[PDB]
Amino acid sequence: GVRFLQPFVNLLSKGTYWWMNAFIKTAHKKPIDLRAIGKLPIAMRALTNYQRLCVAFDAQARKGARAIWRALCHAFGRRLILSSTFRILADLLGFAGPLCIFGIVDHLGKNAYVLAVLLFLALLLQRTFLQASYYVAIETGINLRGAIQTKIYNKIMHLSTSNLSMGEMTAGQICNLVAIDTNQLMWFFFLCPNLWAMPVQIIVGVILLYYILGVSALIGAAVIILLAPVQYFVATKLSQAQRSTLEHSNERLKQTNEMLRGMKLLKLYAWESIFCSRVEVTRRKEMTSLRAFAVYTSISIFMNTAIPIAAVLITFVGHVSFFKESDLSPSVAFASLSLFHILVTPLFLLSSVVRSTVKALVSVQKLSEFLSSAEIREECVQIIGGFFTWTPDGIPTLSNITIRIPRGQLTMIVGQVGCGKSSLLLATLGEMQKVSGAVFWGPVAYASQKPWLLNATVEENITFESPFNKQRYKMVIEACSLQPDIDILPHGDQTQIGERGINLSGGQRQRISVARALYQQTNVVFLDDPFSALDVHLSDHLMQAGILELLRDDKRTVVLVTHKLQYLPHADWIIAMKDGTIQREGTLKDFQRSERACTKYLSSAGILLLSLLVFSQLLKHMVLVAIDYWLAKWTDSDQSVYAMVFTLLCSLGIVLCLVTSVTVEWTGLKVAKRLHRSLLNRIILAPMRFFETTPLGSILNRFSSDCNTIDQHIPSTLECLSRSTLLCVSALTVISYVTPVFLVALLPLAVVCYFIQKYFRVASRDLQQLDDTTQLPLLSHFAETVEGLTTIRAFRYEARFQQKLLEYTDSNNIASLFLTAANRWLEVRMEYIGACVVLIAAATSISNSLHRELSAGLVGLGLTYALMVSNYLNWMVRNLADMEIQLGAVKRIHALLKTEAESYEGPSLIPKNWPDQGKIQIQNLSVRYDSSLKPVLKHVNALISPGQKIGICGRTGSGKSSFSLAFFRMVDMFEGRIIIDGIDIAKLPLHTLRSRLSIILQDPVLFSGTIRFNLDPEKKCSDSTLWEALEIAQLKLVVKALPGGLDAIITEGGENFSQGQRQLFCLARAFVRKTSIFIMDEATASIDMATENILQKVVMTAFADRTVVTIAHRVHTILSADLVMVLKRGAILEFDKPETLLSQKDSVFASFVR
């Protein structure tokens, strides 16, 4: 069952893609689908390409960055060679055409119709073989893409998480790798067959022009030899800028990644200016690289036009009067112009080719450095002599661990923050094979400390490739405290969980991960603090239902690592860790007995610059057509008059063309930088609702792809399109002038071409849309596999995931293949149209201009322009399609620009310093996340006296985090009044409101850089200040134990710091901010109670003269406060006296909970 049949048709059809007819006809009748399009052939599957590639890679290794390149060239092989041979034959015929022109003109001056028929056949043949060469190059490229994609996906498996902690294996870096390297390698492998025919082409060009010029060859030969070395030097100066360009863009992308996943914390206390100025500086450096590249390309185009025109002028002048004394018959003149144009076209192309060439080189260097990452080491739960560290060599954290875990038994690991608990969990998991030690125990379910979700439905995230079960799934759901929240969602179930779970809450994702690890059938289950983002009551219900009733039912083995009170009397073994060592060991008793798109684009381009561009282009082309017409009327013959006219026009042409190129490059640069500056400040001024709503992957990929296309694809493509359209205009005008009868044969051509273009347009749009809709999920899958590595390699589901990726990549490949096949079919029929027009143009010429018109000079112009446009027609159509795609790109940028309604900040209270008196009062407050949705708060009324500690309590979904977010005006549908020292938002813009408070979140984020950049991005602190802030935040000892104390390199999250240490760093931000009001949303989330109590005591003794409002799921912290308010289903209630607030409720909500 297949629909694509290129290898499955007859000899004559493969060239024309006749088979496509049905398909393109079918597409208009019914829209296209993935089940509509077929499967991939036997010789097209990514499995066989990966097979061939790995076999060649092995053969190359038995005999580095160069090795894989050799292997690629080997693997494509014969197909690639064939593409080159087809192109060379097409080139020889393309040169053959102008010779037929020479013969026709010669017989016109005096076996002529034969010249027309043979010329028509030759042109048709060249077109056929050129399009076949392009098709086979595209085939080789798509197979390359598939093979290297599956190779890197297989290698991501054996990659160790110690690389993932480093910047080299950054998830964003790996997805950038996949996407941009697909792109760059595919484009280089489409342009490589084109350049493997430039040398043979130029050689045949000169060997043909000798026999036409004679002794006057010297001038053209000197010109085309003087061209080469200066071009080599220019290309060198170009490549040097381009490589640094790539480095700077690669760092900008990671800065954007770490800027967007933390826009909440960024806008919370408004660190925006710092990150925005940093991205602006990176953009300025990138722009320096780009402007160097653009000036060099402008000089390149200047040379590639100026040297040619001088060559033509010199050669002709030399032949007529300088030495030769043989009158150049017009045939020689026009044939020389034709061969010369054929020679000129490759030189313009090679300059654009370098852009893809150095990019392919850089992409392969990156791919080889990625393949050279560290492997994974091939080998009751038993451990004797534990010893391992996180590098090939270094000081260890795992030292002398001995542990026995009998089946059907609960084991609580406990210990301070940073005691190798998760590390013991991962080493036991075999993900980290110890240096020296024995470990014995299978497919093990496991819920990691930082959960992750798949781009799928909830039911799918909980099944995880296992078949469904009526009672099993319902039990796992009804034990995880998840059914009410699931039913509250917009779709009662199968809700498409967004990327990473943005449209989910903090506790929801944790409960979903625990449900996944609890639903699967296995012996051993590891639970890595599954109680961080849960309250007291949900934790009690989950531990009682799933862990004690559901798990202990089947007598499975459970290793659960957390720190609570209820769990200890329930487990059988207890393991105390300290500084990577087991302090004590055993059971409990023995342990207790032991010791709208193009308008703004053109406006940003400038009404003065694009106008000058169009004007200069038109003027240059008018000069070019006029000089050729004048020369034609002169050749068939005031000789000095014509000589001066020719010499004047030959300088006018180069002046005008140089001006055109310079203007085009300037326009491109301006568009690039204005668009980027607009984009970033449109994203910065967005509300948090827009950031949570929008999928972030779309934002980032649109950002990178669109900006790269505009920076590097829009100038060249736009200028080539303009050149081709002006060439077409010139050719049509010339043919109309030479034969006023051709206007009878032009309308049928236009009508047929118009109808076929209309038919192609809808099928092309459909194929492009399907291409995008299949290309998004593949990259989603790549990202999710890269981040959720530990779980996938714990289950040992690697076969299932590799099979899934094979499915997705095969669908992507078939979509791309059909898009390029439709492209090829349109090109072939357009080339047949061009053959028709040139044929009957030459026929009407040889008939009319000889029999009845009797004109000599017009024949050369007519045939030259016809042979020129017969190729520039297809070239022009391709350039127009490229411009359309890039303009749709620009259009999606412009559509992204204008959303995120202003929500902007908009001086009587600013001039007065923000008061230290922390007296605040909220009267009749409500809150709604989305406009016209359910209310979250209702009739909120509270007051807070100056300099007093304030506690808040409540169940899940009560509204504590909503209370905090509304205290910062992060929820845009609040109703009521918020007064702070007789001062509210009535006279204050949002910036002074972002500077007045401090906030610590339950979700700890940490962007890469140094410790100084995480602690104070403003760089306005002394080192003693930060050392004191760390010694107060109970973090000094773990900071001193790192290389480069205050300058240790931090990566985004990673394992350089556990969750508790990230919480402590957020606390340190709060310490150094030095504001009057504090908000603390669960600073207890991932800190041990033993350290948490003393940490809270020290943080109370430190922040004595300022108001602090806390929301902690720890009872004792709530107990220590004076004014505590309990949030209800929608409302609150305040109470002050510790002895009165505990018996007034009749001991219900605050006493028995304690």
Ligand SMILES: Nc1ncnc2c1ncn2[C@@H]1O[C@H](COP(=O)(O)OP(=O)(O)O)[C@@H](O)[C@H]1O
């Ligand atoms: N991949 C890694 N690279 C560097 N250091 C690590 C890595 N993994 C763990 N560590 C170190 O070992 C300790 C492991 O702490 P951990 O067991 O995760 O704490 P907890 O279980 O309380 O969250 C941390 O202090 C950390 O510094």
Ligand SMILES: Nc1ncnc2c1ncn2[C@@H]1O[C@H](COP(=O)(O)OP(=O)(O)O)[C@@H](O)[C@H]1O
């Ligand atoms: N970003 C959001 N978009 C839409 N609804 C939200 C959002 N955040 C919270 N909610 C809703 O608000 C209610 C409770 O708010 P929340 O601040 O999350 O309470 P808690 O902090 O106790 O979890 C929940 O029913 C939840 O569905």
Ligand SMILES: [Mg+2]
């Ligand atoms: Mg941990």
Ligand SMILES: [Mg+2]
């Ligand atoms: Mg919360």
